[PDB]
Design a protein around this ligand. Structure first.
Ligand SMILES: [Mn+2]
Ligand SMILES: [Mn+2]
Lengths: 300, 299
């Protein structure tokens, strides 16, 4: 109607925004993304892109009045948690840098970010070994709880002067295709984890939800082009949905710390703590360990 | 375009246009984000009857993201129009569409029949002085500050479908005197809490800058409006005066006359009004004694 629209309808700002290796819809009221879609493959998760050189910055395309800023996060007790992981963009330093735009970031628990959420990310990358193409939609969720008088309440903290919303939960929708020629039905799974320290006791399936139920909670329709009348396999039935256990994940963490060891004694402590946990180093750990020891012997 | 092979997720925020209002829906909260309406002298006159309308789900909203009457009834909250039904007396179709729950928000009973209603009346009143009035209404969930400084957003969700109950409501009023007028435009933004508000607060207490409201709601109102141009504050070019108690209490009483189905209930409207230390004006006595003779001609 021209009369209503004479000075324009209000702008919500939810238009899809495309980047090198991810797309997102931004929530200008909460200063966080509504959803972030990415595609993962064997080649994308390989390359020389170094996360150490990347910096968090406001997304230059976002109107500043609706953008978050590093000052909102630093000192707030919450971490800047990627929705599209930086580890999924080793192939392109430009793609990785764009995952450090705050339009891709939500306030996330430190332990969750470096723990259970990281392991889900790793599981998503692992799926590329068994599937050729993997699509992932990540995003925040603000869920209700039942107050003492039975009534359901949504409560969430809001940090910084820009009032960046802290989600109560995080969701991931994983879609995997064996290949573009294959006749095998696609594998899909929806998962919802609280934005807090989880640990190693709960398996990923304990956080699995039906796609319908997640769409009702998030107010979103994921992968709308996907025809649901066809057969879509449960990813936790056709695949494993098993994250790394304590031993494997610690060995993985201790292997990464090798490359940052700036002294020989840092490097032996890494080995020390790994031995104290009775986790025997694997061949890959030793190769990097020996490589770094002679490297550090050749430096001042 | 390998990301799009199976489509980006759907937020469902596209503008939805109706006979006399438009809105953007929030599928997660099951309430509108904003509702824009245009008011004029002609629109607010006509034979469209409110009592012929029913609240119903919006037929164009996906049922999975829609609210239902079962969510509101018994929840302690009223179904509150953003675009009021009273602005569509010219068209029964327009009025019926304001009863789609896509235009509805959980609203405090007193706020809806009281302070918010009075604001709706002031907007209609503007059509005496401005030939065109645009209004954007919607809910707001704002944070409250704990004693330690932490800002917490806390709102209730009602019904099986978890319809969000907002803490505040907002209105953006834009008025133009005429399409041939050199006088500048008039604009104002207001934010009232979603609760009982008495008669002491004047509307200007709840007035906020349009910049602030936009930062709180994540919306850009009237983007095609040039803000470097001559844009006047609505409360300096107009009065921003709501009806006081006596004016409003009389307005409420004159309308309960038309619903009096018996004489004994018709004079109790007179009695309650006199016991309210308000004197019936001519319009009251006019329609009052008319309904009195009408009720003597029935039963
Ligand atoms: Mn992370
Ligand atoms: Mn109302």
């Amino acid at each position: 109607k021209a009369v209503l629209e004479q000075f324009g309808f209000p702008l919500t700002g939810t238009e899809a925004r495309c980047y090198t290796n991810h797309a997102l819809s931004y929530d200008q009221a909460k200063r966080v993304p509504r959803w972030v879609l990415e595609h993962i493959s064997k080649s994308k998760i390989m390359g020389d892109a170094d996360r150490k050189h990347c910096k968090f910055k406001p997304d230059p395309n976002i109107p500043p009045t609706f953008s978050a800023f590093n000052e909102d996060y630093v000192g707030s007790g919450w971490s800047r948690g990627h929705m599209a992981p930086a580890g999924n963009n080793k192939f392109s330093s430009k793609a990785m840098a764009e995952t450090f735009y705050l339009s891709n970031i939500v306030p996330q628990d430190f332990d969750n970010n470096s723990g259970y959420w990281n392991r889900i990310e790793m599981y998503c990358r692992e799926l590329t070994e068994r599937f050729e193409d993997v699509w992932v939609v990540s995003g925040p969720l603000t869920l209700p709880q039942t107050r003492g008088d039975g009534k359901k309440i949504v409560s969430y903290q809001v940090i910084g002067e820009d009032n960046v919303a802290v989600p109560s939960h995080l969701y991931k929708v994983i879609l995997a295709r064996r290949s573009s020629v294959s006749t095998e039905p696609l594998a899909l799974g929806a998962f919802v984890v609280p934005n807090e320290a989880i640990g190693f006791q709960p398996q990923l399936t304990e956080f699995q939800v039906s796609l319908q139920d997640l769409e009702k909670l998030s107010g979103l329709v994921f992968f709308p082009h996907l025809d649901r009348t066809s057969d879509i396999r449960n990813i936790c039935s056709v695949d494993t949905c098993k994250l790394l256990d304590f031993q494997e994940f610690t060995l993985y963490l201790s292997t990464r710390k090798i490359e940052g060891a700036r002294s020989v004694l840092r490097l032996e402590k890494i080995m020390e703590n790994l031995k104290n946990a009775e986790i025997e180093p694997d061949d890959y750990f030793m190769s990097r360990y020996e490589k770094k020891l002679e490297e550090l012997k050749a430096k001042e």
